[model samples]
Target: MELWLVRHGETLWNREGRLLGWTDLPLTAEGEAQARRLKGALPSLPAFSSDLLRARRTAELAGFSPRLYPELREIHFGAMEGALWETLDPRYKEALLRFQGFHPPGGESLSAFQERVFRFLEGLKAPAVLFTHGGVVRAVLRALGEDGLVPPGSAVAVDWPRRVLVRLALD
Candidate 1:
């Protein structure tokens, strides 16, 4: 199945270089503008979004009223939900940078997070848009052998478990 994964627009945490897990936050003003730029840039397809406010808002601004799915949420950061990136322990930082061996305190493990994300993707019935977060997008990209880093409000399309089709980053 074809998947269009949209990393939701920036938030205050994003500007501050903080880990954005399950702690719900709204889009920054610039984030809203970034989302607006996506309007009409994406294919009109069935759409889904993480239940978090940022993701939901991005979908709306991008001109979709997507079905909300908790399964699409970013990993539950648990105790690390909003930690500043620079202050993090090296082990946690490395785990995140390498996308492995991460088991945030009181939060979801990296392995489990990938499983939840992949499971949801495997269940998709058709090509669709997914309004989600950075980690979710990174997981999909890395699974497809890309470096998995994209700007805020960017998106990537892929043939699930296969190849990346396109990448979009609108001003």
Candidate 2:
């Protein structure tokens, strides 16, 4: 299946370089504009998005009435949701380092995050556009047999929006 995975537009937290892990933040003006621009760039396809306002708004601005899938939500950061990385307590930092395999206290684990994302993609019909967070996009890329993560803010092509059409196929 061909997936058009996209990261949500920038937000105030994003511009400030804050770690927005599970914190829900609204989109900035520039973010909205970027979404609109992306909307103009998209081709017709079934669309889906995580159940976050920022992602939902991006999907809306992108001219897609995406189905909100809770399974595709961003990885929950628990207590670390809104705090900047540097502001976290020393213990939290230590916990972060040691707890690499699991989500932090009150957060979702990396494996859990990747699992649900793969489940979501596996169940999809494909040839679809998904408006979600950077983490979700990266996980999806990894699930598709690609190596390394697609850094935040970068776009990857399955079948360029305007060029050849690609259809979904199950492996």
Candidate 3:
């Protein structure tokens, strides 16, 4: 299966380098502009989006009416929802940097997050566009062996369970 994973545009939290998880935040003005850049750049396909406002809004701005799914949401950051990266604990920081062994307080675990994400992917029956979060995109990219660092309002396409096809950054 082919999938296009789009990381939604920036919000204030994104600019402030705050950990954004289940907290719903709207896009900044520039974030809206970033989403508009994808209006004609992506392939026409069936679309889906995380249930979050930002991802849904990005899909709308990008010219798609995607079905929304909570399974596509970013990991619930719980107590760390708005923690600044600069002041994060060393243990949490290490887990994030290594992309493993993360279990945020009152939040989801990394292993559980991956399982949810992959399980959702596994159910897709056709090529589709996914408007989701950075973490979701990172998980997919890193699973395929890429470095998994993409900017806000960017997208990556992959041959599912195989190699990455391309990455798009339209800002």
Candidate 4:
């Protein structure tokens, strides 16, 4: 089945360049607008979302009363939660850029994380729209061998485990 994956709207933390995970944050006004605009762009379908406030709110604004799915939540940031990237410790940045297998203390490991997220995707019984976090999108895209990230309120359409049809993200 096809999957349309959308990133949650911008949170205050996003504008601040903070590491966002687990911690729930409300969407900014701009975020809300972004969400609403999605209705005009994305196809109507059964929707699912991360249980976090930002993702739930995004689905609501996008005109979908999605079923909440904790499995769709972003990676847990652990020790670096709420940290600004520019000021974050270099060690984490090194690991992040290395794109190697590493996760922060108390966070999910890369391999384990991928398995859970992939499991969630593979279990889909039909085509659906998913409102989740950037990390979730990144993980799926990476597994599909796609590159880069989807911006806040952006989306990527893919055929289950492979074949990217489109990536829509406003700069």
Candidate 5:
């Protein structure tokens, strides 16, 4: 089945270069506008979003009343939730480097995240749209065996969003 994975619009934390690990923050004003524009760009399909406000807003502005799923939420950042990169603790930095492959302390591992995405897709009944985080999109692409396929901020469209949908899909 086709999967359209859309990244949520930018947030204050996103612009401020802060770690957003599960903070549940809303999108910036520009983000809201971007989501609204994206709504008109997407295919008409059943959509799902992480329970986070940023994602939900994207879904709403996109004109789809998406089903919220906690499982679709961004990976929790634990103590690093809102910390700026410059102010990150040394130990946290080291841990984050090591976190590329495994889970950080009190956080989900990359493999675990991939497994969850796989599970979600395995249970889906039709082509769907996923309004989620960049990390979630990355994980989903990796699960689909399309690793290193698209850089951040790129959109992919397969089928099922709009007739001319700009949905993000990876080969």
Candidate 6:
């Protein structure tokens, strides 16, 4: 199956470069506009979204009422919810970037997060559009053997149980 994995549009935390995982933030006006643009760029396939407000809002604005799933949420940051990345402890940042063993004080372990994402993916029955977060998108790309970031509002197409087919530019 093909999956159009998309990162949710801009949030205030996104603009400020904060580590935004599970913070329940809303989309900025520009973020909503960015999502609206996706209406034309992507197909109206069955949609799924992280249950977070930002992801849900993006899906709605992008013209889909998605099936909400907590497993699709960004990796839980534990205690690091809204902290600026620049101000985080170097060790914490290192663990996060390295994908080593980052289990924040109250968040999920990297492995746990991956398991959740992969489980959802393994259960896919058909082609679908996913409105999610950067971390989810990054995880998907990494699982597909691509190592890089997808900008917010970008759409990546990947063939399930296979590889990346294409990445659409953010509008």
Which candidate has the top score in lDDT? 3
Ranked by TM-score, the better of candidates 3 and 4 is 3
User: RMSD in angstroms, candidate 6?
Assistant: 1.1
Winner of 4 and 6 under TM-score? 6
Candidate 4, residues 64-113, lDDT tens digits: the string is 98998899999888887898889977777876654457688887766777
Q: Which stretches of candidate 4 lie over 4 Å from their true place?
A: none
Which parts of model 3 are misplaced by more than 4 Å?
none
Candidates in order, TM-scores: namely 0.98, 0.78, 0.99, 0.93, 0.78, 0.95
Angstrom error at residue 45, model 1: 0.3
Say which candidate scores most in TM-score: 3
The RMSD of every model to the true structure, in order and in angstroms, is: 0.7, 6.4, 0.6, 1.5, 5.1, 1.1
Error of 4 at 29 (Å): 0.7
Q: Write the per-residue lDDT of candidate 5 for residues 92-144, one digit (tens) a residue.
A: 66655444664556777767776676687678799888888877765655444
Q: What would the per-residue lDDT of candidate 2 be over residues 39-77, giving only the tens digit for each residue?
A: 557668899988898889988987999989988787788
List runs of model 2 lying over 4 Å from the truth. 87-100, 143-154, 159-171
Candidate 6, 19-95: lDDT as tens digits: 89988999999998889888879987999999999899889888898999999999998888888999989998898
Clashes (N, CA, C under 3 Å) per candidate: 0, 2, 0, 0, 7, 1
Residue 78, model 2: lDDT of 79
lDDT for 16 (candidate 5): 89
- Estimate candidate 6's alpha-carbon lDDT, on a 0 to 1 scale: 0.88
lDDT of 6 at 116: 96
Which regions in candidate 5 have their CA more than 4 angstroms from the true location?
86-99, 144-154, 158-171
lDDT of 5 at 57: 87
